[PDB]
Design a protein around this ligand. Structure first.
Ligand SMILES: O=C(CO)C[C@@H](Cc1ccccc1)C(=O)O
Ligand SMILES: O=C(CO)C[C@@H](Cc1ccccc1)C(=O)O
Ligand SMILES: O=C(CO)C[C@@H](Cc1ccccc1)C(=O)O
Ligand SMILES: [Zn+2]
Ligand SMILES: [Zn+2]
Ligand SMILES: [Zn+2]
Lengths: 307, 307, 307
């Protein structure tokens, strides 16, 4: 694809194709999108974040990370679609235009690039990072159990060979630390959304503790509205609630960390399919999944701009 | 640097310094080394191949190209070290002497001179050539995706702005065509090695197709022996296998082309570092990298002169 | 004969005659047909596939292989008729024209050339390949039990001397691997049809397992429609259903592998005669068999192109 207009949004792509997509979008929309490198993965690959901004100096922002778990392909595919959609709707959709005229959006399409490359090369269902450490044959850490929020507590594994291994210590994975450093340095994020795949859930803060967040009433209603918006398109039904009460106790998670940094609108999406295809979601569902998910994300952003 | 005996092999050099090195070596070893110009780069720079021979009539040959991707500095530096090593060991080391007594070695230290100059003056991480495509504000082609081997197929980009742009057509880049004409004209190459950097891999034919080569068993055995030899010095671990099965589909590759030309011992080395420094490998690792890589290359040469 | 217009379609031909037929057809219809060599048989004979295309780039395709079991002569004879039929109907039959205007068809008339030559020279009833086994006086493998789909499981023999020997490992036979690599590299096949002889059956996925495929309802109806079309010409009755429930458990089959690759419309045809003549079907039945079988095949293609 020599243009984001020739890019096939209805098919799954490789890391190279997505990184190329990034430069095309920036070239095509220079006054709106820029590519930031926030670090290097364990295997030295650049970690890229697309910044959508219409100006200002460190305006209130919205963070959206996708693909932290490499095998959740629908998320990177949705991230690419999101990127294009932002450039299409700014100046077209009144609501989204209003958001971008006052806030910035930071989009990380491939949060775990080493694992992503690996899902294309050796193992389609690989989910962890590709870090190697100390004395252990096994490789990789579950980057979404590596954050400094109840790190190492029940809801994560201490075995390096486990699919839910949390890592040696909090923020040990550069893919996670890079985000932590960027967000802390920025200091003005109002929303933090982490996109994952399958189970069709919209969850809010704390998977590591049964303690209820101070903003439970509001986040719960925002979630309810977001799920209804998402559903209005194709009838896809999502369940919502706090992580621990909806799926199970899970520690070292990204939104528990962001919420604890004071980022109020922290939510995690588990995208399409309830098990029919699971992680192997057909490419024919990429666009429909992205479209409906966008409605839910926009709903959250709208509550962020006026709150 | 008035002598190859005073040349600093432990530091990175410029095109001029490496080109000057070539003449010093030829002047110091006239009966063994000669400098051949196989063409000119897009920007007019001479393309040099050092020929190591002890006589004969176009004896079976070994081709070794380095620096096709300009930013992979460890390769050009290793290429210089190799040139010096050949002159030191011939006549002294039994094995290498035997190899050069029946075979010639053609060494191209800087396969992409324009890109190399660019990495020193404008962009340290530039990797493509510097050709101007007429209809694009972008520059260069990925020279190792421009070969006539599955050209234009999946594993390369058709976008002139891509870092993996394959180019207008097979062999469009003069840096590639120069090698193709040279090797075809020669007609008696038995080995073809392409040196690249970082990931620590030794790969054999076909990145453009899942078809396993007819000589898979043999090249896999050669690779295994080569990696063990390389590892024996400092413990550096390399993985090996076909390009597509080890990494991923990649088209327009040099060894896919050479192998299809009937050059059986076609391999590509991805030198040191697994990501700690990536392309910015410290100068302090130049000599050790060259030393260990030499053992691997020698191993391949030995399997070529006997089989 | 110097023209496909004077070619005798009502008689059985040799490998050479069929291969010459291919060139005549390509010479007469250069804008529609091309000859591709996808590999070399065990005994080094070229393996050819006829590509029918009206243009495009990697257009959705339909794969058709015949003669994988050498003694099933009615299949290769039907393949030749098929090739001619496509060149006669494109631009004449609205339905077929529509299929070729959006899709490509790859036809392999003699999937097992070594065996085919053997059925003409030494044993008319030979069905396996002609590969030589290390420690055995017996020759060949049942190419349709050598695919990587339940390979080595119940429904095949591990004894080299058996007529249903599955081989040393999945894809051991180059005749099979050649198709696997081609189809995998292509990546855009929508239908995979394997043509065999006698029993008059149309079967869909899984002979190696009783597990029902996800698309069972659709394929069963497509099969029902295909057999009705086939029967409509001369009244030839075909039975349909899954391989395992219709014939018996059989492992390493082509359509089980193709379906598992994501190629939905995977069917196997067992042509004319239910036992009267068996493999020795009279040449006088070649054209009638080909004609009626075409209606069944066209039916599947129509379902493949639409939706
Ligand atoms: O994406 C998921 C599985 O597909 C759900 C997440 C849930 C989770 C959330 C926070 C911390 C750890 C785990 C997981 O278990 O890793
Ligand atoms: O040097 C490399 C990156 O530093 C790895 C090579 C791997 C490759 C090898 C052969 C053909 C195409 C690609 C590349 O992707 O260009
Ligand atoms: O064509 C056939 C015999 O004439 C039926 C096929 C049935 C089969 C189908 C799938 C896998 C293996 C065998 C065979 O047994 O070789
Ligand atoms: Zn996840
Ligand atoms: Zn390289
Ligand atoms: Zn058969």
């Amino acid at each position: 694809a020599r243009s984001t207009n020739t890019f096939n949004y209805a098919t799954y792509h490789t890391l190279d194709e997505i990184y190329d997509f990034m430069d095309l979008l920036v070239a095509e929309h220079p006054q709106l999108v820029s590519k930031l490198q926030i670090g290097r993965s364990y295997e030295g690959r650049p970690i890229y974040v697309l910044k959508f901004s219409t100006g200002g100096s460190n305006r209130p922002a919205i963070w959206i990370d996708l693909g932290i778990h490499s095998r959740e392909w629908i998320t990177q595919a949705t991230g690419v679609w999101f990127a294009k959609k932002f450039t299409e709707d700014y100046g077209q959709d009144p609501s989204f235009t209003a958001i971008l005229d006052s806030m910035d959006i930071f989009l990380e399409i491939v949060t775990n690039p080493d694992g992503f490359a690996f899902t294309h090369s050796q193992n389609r269902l690989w989910r962890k990072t590709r870090s190697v450490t100390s004395s252990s044959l096994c490789v990789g850490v579950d980057a979404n159990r590596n954050w400094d929020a109840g790190f190492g507590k029940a809801g994560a594994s201490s075995s390096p060979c486990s699919e839910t291994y949390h890592g040696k210590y909090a923020n040990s994975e550069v893919e996670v630390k890079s985000i932590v450093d960027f967000v802390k340095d920025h200091g003005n994020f109002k929303a933090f959304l982490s996109i994952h795949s399958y189970s069709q859930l919209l969850l809010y803060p704390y998977g590591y503790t049964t303690q209820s967040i101070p903003d439970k009433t509001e986040l719960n209603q925002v979630a309810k509205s977001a799920v209804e918006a998402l559903k209005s398109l194709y009838g896809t039904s999502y369940k919502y609630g706090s992580i621990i009460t909806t799926i199970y106790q899970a520690s070292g998670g990204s939104i528990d960390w962001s919420y604890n940094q004071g980022i109020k609108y922290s939510f995690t999406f588990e995208l399409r399919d309830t098990g029919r295809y699971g992680f192997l979601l057909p490419a024919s569902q990429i666009i429909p999944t992205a479209q409906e998910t966008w409605l839910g994300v926009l709903t959250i952003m709208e509550h962020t701009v006026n709150n």
